Amino acid sequence: MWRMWKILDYRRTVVLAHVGMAVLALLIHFILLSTENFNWLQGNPY
Amino acid sequence: MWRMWKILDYRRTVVLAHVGMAVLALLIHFILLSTENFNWLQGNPY
Amino acid sequence: TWEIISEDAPEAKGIGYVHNQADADMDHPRFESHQFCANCLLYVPHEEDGDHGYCAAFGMDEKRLVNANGWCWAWEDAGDAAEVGPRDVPADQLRRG
Amino acid sequence: MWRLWKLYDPRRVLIGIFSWLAVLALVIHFILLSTDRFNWVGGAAV
Amino acid sequence: VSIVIIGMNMLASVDWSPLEFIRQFFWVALEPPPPEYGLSLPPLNDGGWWLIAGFTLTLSVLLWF
Amino acid sequence: CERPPVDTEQKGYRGTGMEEVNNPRLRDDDLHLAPEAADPVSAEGPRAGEIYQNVEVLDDLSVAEFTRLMQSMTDWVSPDEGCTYCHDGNDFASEELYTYQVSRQMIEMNRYVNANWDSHMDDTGVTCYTCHRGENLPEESWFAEPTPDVNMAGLGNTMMQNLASEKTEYTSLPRNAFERYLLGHDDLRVEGDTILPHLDEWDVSLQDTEASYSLMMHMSAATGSNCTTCHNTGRLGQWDESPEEREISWHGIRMTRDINANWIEPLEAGQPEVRLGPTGDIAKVQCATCHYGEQLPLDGAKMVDDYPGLMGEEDADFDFLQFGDLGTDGLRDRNA
Ligand code: BCL
Ligand code: BCL
Ligand code: BCL
Ligand SMILES: COC(C)(C)C/C=C/C(C)=C/C=C/C(C)=C/C=C/C(C)=C/C=C\C=C(C)\C=C\C=C(C)\C=C\C=C(C)\C=C\CC(C)(C)OC
Ligand code: HEC
Numbered sequence: 206m207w208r209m210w211k212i213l214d215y216r217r218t219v220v221l222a223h224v225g226m227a228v229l230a231l232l233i234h235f236i237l238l239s240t241e242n243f244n245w246l247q248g249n250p251y
Numbered sequence: 252m253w254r255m256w257k258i259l260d261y262r263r264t265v266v267l268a269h270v271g272m273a274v275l276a277l278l279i280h281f282i283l284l285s286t287e288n289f290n291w292l293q294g295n296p297y
Numbered sequence: 298t299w300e301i302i303s304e305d306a307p308e309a310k311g312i313g314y315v316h317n318q319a320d321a322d323m324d325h326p327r328f329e330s331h332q333f334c335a336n337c338l339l340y341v342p343h344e345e346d347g348d349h350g351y352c353a354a355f356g357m358d359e360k361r362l363v364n365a366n367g368w369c370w371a372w373e374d375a376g377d378a379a380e381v382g383p384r385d386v387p388a389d390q391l392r393r394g
Numbered sequence: 395m396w397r398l399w400k401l402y403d404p405r406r407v408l409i410g411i412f413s414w415l416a417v418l419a420l421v422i423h424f425i426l427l428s429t430d431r432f433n434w435v436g437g438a439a440v
Numbered sequence: 441v442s443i444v445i446i447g448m449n450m451l452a453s454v455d456w457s458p459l460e461f462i463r464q465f466f467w468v469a470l471e472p473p474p475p476e477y478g479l480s481l482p483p484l485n486d487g488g489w490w491l492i493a494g495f496t497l498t499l500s501v502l503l504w505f
Numbered sequence: 506c507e508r509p510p511v512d513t514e515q516k517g518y519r520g521t522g523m524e525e526v527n528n529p530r531l532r533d534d535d536l537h538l539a540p541e542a543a544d545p546v547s548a549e550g551p552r553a554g555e556i557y558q559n560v561e562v563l564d565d566l567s568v569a570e571f572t573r574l575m576q577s578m579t580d581w582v583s584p585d586e587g588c589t590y591c592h593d594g595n596d597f598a599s600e601e602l603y604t605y606q607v608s609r610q611m612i613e614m615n616r617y618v619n620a621n622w623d624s625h626m627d628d629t630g631v632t633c634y635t636c637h638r639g640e641n642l643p644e645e646s647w648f649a650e651p652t653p654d655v656n657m658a659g660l661g662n663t664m665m666q667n668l669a670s671e672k673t674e675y676t677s678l679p680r681n682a683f684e685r686y687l688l689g690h691d692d693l694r695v696e697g698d699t700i701l702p703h704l705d706e707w708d709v710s711l712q713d714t715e716a717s718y719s720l721m722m723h724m725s726a727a728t729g730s731n732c733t734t735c736h737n738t739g740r741l742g743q744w745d746e747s748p749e750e751r752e753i754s755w756h757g758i759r760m761t762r763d764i765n766a767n768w769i770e771p772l773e774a775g776q777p778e779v780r781l782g783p784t785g786d787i788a789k790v791q792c793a794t795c796h797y798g799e800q801l802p803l804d805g806a807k808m809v810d811d812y813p814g815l816m817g818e819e820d821a822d823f824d825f826l827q828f829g830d831l832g833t834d835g836l837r838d839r840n841a
């Protein structure tokens with residue numbers, strides 16, 4: 206799929222991928238903190 | 252009925268159609284989520 | 298011993314206690330033509346009468362027995378007392394707390 | 395339907411699709427987390 | 441720094457739930473110190489974070505000036 | 506969104522903006538319908554205290570009126586359960602069930618408020634049905650807000666605030682307003698009574714002001730009122746600028762505080778665990794437990810006179826000023 210970079214500007218796509226994955230990783234980690242069974246810092250029984 | 256596209260611009264009609272149909276489809280799906288007999292995630296009796 | 302109550306006593310007059318299901322307030326709102334004293338939740342049969350028994354509306358008074366074919370509009374179904382309590386409190390927590 | 399890409403710029407269609415898919419999957423995953431039955435990390439029983 | 445302090449305290453008040461954060465976005469806040477502290481420096485979770493957020497916000501607007 | 510027509514009433518002088526606007530299409534019309542009272546049975550013959558083995562509250566009622574009261578209470582609090590909701594099967598002299606002890610307290614409380622709180626309820630009085638409306642539980646009770654013993658070095662300490670709550674009518678206002686005023690007797694006044702400050706005599710904080718605000722949020726929605734029906738908000742702390750509703754609802758606060766502190770909270774010990782709130786407390790009365798969003802509970806229907814047994818004797822100790830207002834003689838030790 207090297208042709209994908211003749212459509213999508215690779216420089217902008219790389220930056221927006223890192224920015225987007227930053228939001229998603231922070232969001233998923235925060236969601237796990239909010240749950241009782243997956244907050245590793247709280248240490249509730251599973 | 253192809254003559255419809257000598258009247259409207261077909262390119263923008265299709266883009267407008269997708270946005271309108273997306274808004275309507277989310278409207279209907281959310282409305283069913285608010286009803287009791289058609290909230291498939293809630294699973295109330297029918 | 299176990300005197301039977303008077304149908305003309307004020308306690309009976311007040312609740313319409315009648316020795317027979319016939320001659321009752323058949324036009325009273327609370328009334329089905331199957332309610333007898335024996336069918337009443339408030340009725341405890343007497344050990345040695347055969348035809349009478351205690352009535353909880355009369356404080357289970359020994360000298361205020363009721364005929365098993367009687368009726369008053371205080372009748373309640375003996376089909377109750379099967380289930381006791383709020384029907385959503387578990388039985389473990391129902392008694393005392 | 396190959397002519398669809400002679401009309402609509404491939405980059406804008408793919409960006410539009412990707413934005414819709416990202417928002418939609420986020421919204422579906424969030425809706426599931428909001429329900430008692432399909433909150434997979436809330437760990438409820440059915 | 442001010443926005444991070446306010447945002448993290450806002451998020452912490454809803455038990456770190458991003459969903460509950462959106463649900464409560466208009467309602468959450470970094471709360472000022474309770475009256476008993478007067479003008480002293482209160483503990484972080486009793487208005488201390490508010491005082492730091494207010495101090496850095498004041499500094500940023502003054503530097504922006 | 507709503508739409509016209511809306512019912513409007515004038516609460517103050519023309520042009521003051523003191524008006525009530527109501528949506529007639531938002532009223533339930535079934536929750537507020539008073540049950541049809543039973544026919545008056547005879548009050549002759551011996552009293553209930555002479556007939557019944559275990560009667561402590563309804564001693565001075567006839568046998569007929571005692572059973573009429575018992576059937577009425579069954580319809581009011583547990584129609585779908587029957588007499589065995591409170592009574593242990595066929596042994597009506599038994600006090601085993603917690604609902605029996607609670608209901609015995611509920612009769613004593615119903616008699617107490619009907620005999621001493623005409624300063625609020627006038628002549629209408631209340632019945633088991635005013636609060637229960639045909640349910641085992643009043644739909645409109647409250648529990649204490651949980652107190653989590655904050656970290657003191659962590660983050661996100663809401664001081665009972667900053668969360669949308671149905672207690673505060675979806676404001677970010679303090680959520681513990683009921684505990685402070687409807688069970689406790691904390692001061693509700695926020696306005697200084699002078700033109701110039703005396704900060705060492707009157708220094709109410711804005712947090713205390715928002716707590717009194719949050720109680721007012723409730724007292725408005727709980728009676729289908731708004732701030733204007735009890736106040737001229739331009740001059741909020743002026744009693745002579747307020748309608749007589751403010752004086753009535755003043756006693757409604759002290760009566761609700763009386764109900765919670767002296768009659769409801771003593772019942773907390775013997776409640777089942779399923780019934781208690783998150784803190785482990787008993788459900789308590791707020792303004793909507795009787796009003797359910799209407800100024801006159803059950804459309805102001807006077808039900809008390811139809812049922813002898815729910816009216817007590819006017820206590821010689823009653824003050825209505827001994828609930829946190831110059832004295833605490835009408836409140837027990839605990840409160841909250
Ligand atoms: C306790 C363990 C948690 C968990 C905790 C975490 C944490 C913490 C992280 C991840 C991250 C990831 N997890 Mg995980 N994850 C769990 C369960 C899942 C399940 C599942 C069906 O159960 C799936 C499919 C995933 C998938 C993923 C990936 C999207 C991602 C890792 C990158 C990758 O490998 O790309 C493979 C995927 C693809 C190549 C296609 C998908 C990629 C696209 C671009 C992302 C779209 C996501 C979309 C918006 C839906 C999000 C749903 C969320 C619940 C919000 N997880 C369980 C519930 N997961 C990381 C992340 O968020 O990266 C940014 C991360 O930091
Ligand atoms: C309530 C009972 C049923 C149910 C009853 C129905 C009924 C009835 C219908 C659907 C339909 C749909 N349902 Mg359903 N559905 C249910 C629950 C779901 C759930 C869920 C999470 O539970 C999901 C994800 C769906 C999803 C769907 C979709 C597949 C479909 C709506 C298509 C649409 O939006 O048209 C709107 C059009 C769009 C959104 C187009 C937008 C898409 C693209 C990606 C936009 C990109 C923009 C682009 C760049 C612009 C240029 C494009 C050019 C052409 C190049 N349903 C429940 C279980 N559902 C409908 C259907 O079948 O349609 C075919 C339908 O009639
Ligand atoms: C989700 C839709 C995307 C979008 C996706 C696409 C796709 C796919 C294509 C274009 C194409 C074009 N877009 Mg574009 N484009 C958008 C909106 C705009 C707007 C504007 C200010 O509204 C302008 C001036 C343009 C300009 C252009 C032209 C350069 C080009 C041809 C005109 C056209 O087809 O318009 C169509 C667009 C509109 C008429 C505007 C629609 C406005 C919508 C209703 C509001 C924004 C949508 C939002 C994300 C969700 C809406 C929900 C609510 C209803 C608001 N786009 C929005 C942001 N655009 C085409 C191209 O590449 O030419 C070769 C093409 O194939
Ligand atoms: C988790 O979040 C992340 C990190 C992802 C980012 C998100 C952040 C978000 C969403 C933040 C949201 C912020 C919002 C919505 C904030 C809302 C702010 C509002 C509405 C503020 C409004 C008014 C606030 C005022 C006016 C504050 C005034 C405080 C002042 C002026 C404080 C002054 C304090 C001083 C000068 C401190 C003195 C300290 C000294 C040194 C004197 O003490 C000894
Ligand atoms: C409002 C001030 C009330 C009046 C008047 C009466 N009751 Fe009540 N009752 C009230 C509350 C707030 C509660 C607690 C509800 C909860 O969620 O815990 C109760 C509770 C009872 C109960 C116990 C129900 C149960 O736990 O299952 C009973 C049996 C009961 N009330 C009976 C009762 C009767 C007979 C009344 C009239 C004489 C009566 N209540 C009046 C509030 C109020």
Ligand code: HEC
Pocket residue numbers: 693694695696697717718721722724725728730731732733734735736741742750751752754755758
């Ligand atoms: C009647 C049911 C009321 C409604 C509706 C509202 N208020 Fe009220 N308010 C009411 C009373 C009886 C009192 C006196 C309380 C006391 O025990 O002294 C109050 C008091 C206030 C105050 C305190 C003012 C002061 O005396 O210093 C404020 C600030 C206040 N009320 C505000 C307020 C607002 C904003 C309301 C609408 C949301 C509102 N009240 C409604 C009775 C009633």
Ligand code: HEC
Pocket residue numbers: 618625626627628629630631635724725728750751753754757758760761790791792793794795796800801802804805806
């Ligand atoms: C049940 C025991 C009640 C509680 C708790 C509260 N209220 Fe009440 N209120 C109640 C009755 C029976 C009545 C009389 C109805 C009638 O027809 O006269 C009232 C009256 C009021 C009023 C006056 C309404 C008017 O005169 O138009 C107000 C303003 C009022 N109630 C408000 C109110 C508030 C704010 C309460 C909580 C603090 C409250 N009430 C509690 C019954 C009961």
Ligand code: HEC
Pocket residue numbers: 339353354356357373556557558559560561562563564575576578579582583587588589590591592597598604605606608609612
């Ligand atoms: C809870 C709300 C009750 C329901 C429902 C019913 N009863 Fe009751 N009953 C209740 C209490 C709290 C008491 C104690 C009375 C007191 O003042 O202390 C009673 C008492 C009786 C009695 C007297 C029994 C005796 O003391 O010997 C009888 C006969 C009685 N109750 C009958 C009765 C019937 C027939 C009911 C169903 C319709 C019924 N009760 C319901 C509380 C409650």
Ligand code: SF4
Pocket residue numbers: 314333334335337338339340351352353354355363367368369370371372373
């Ligand atoms: S109350 Fe019951 S037991 Fe007593 S007379 Fe009536 S039906 Fe018979």
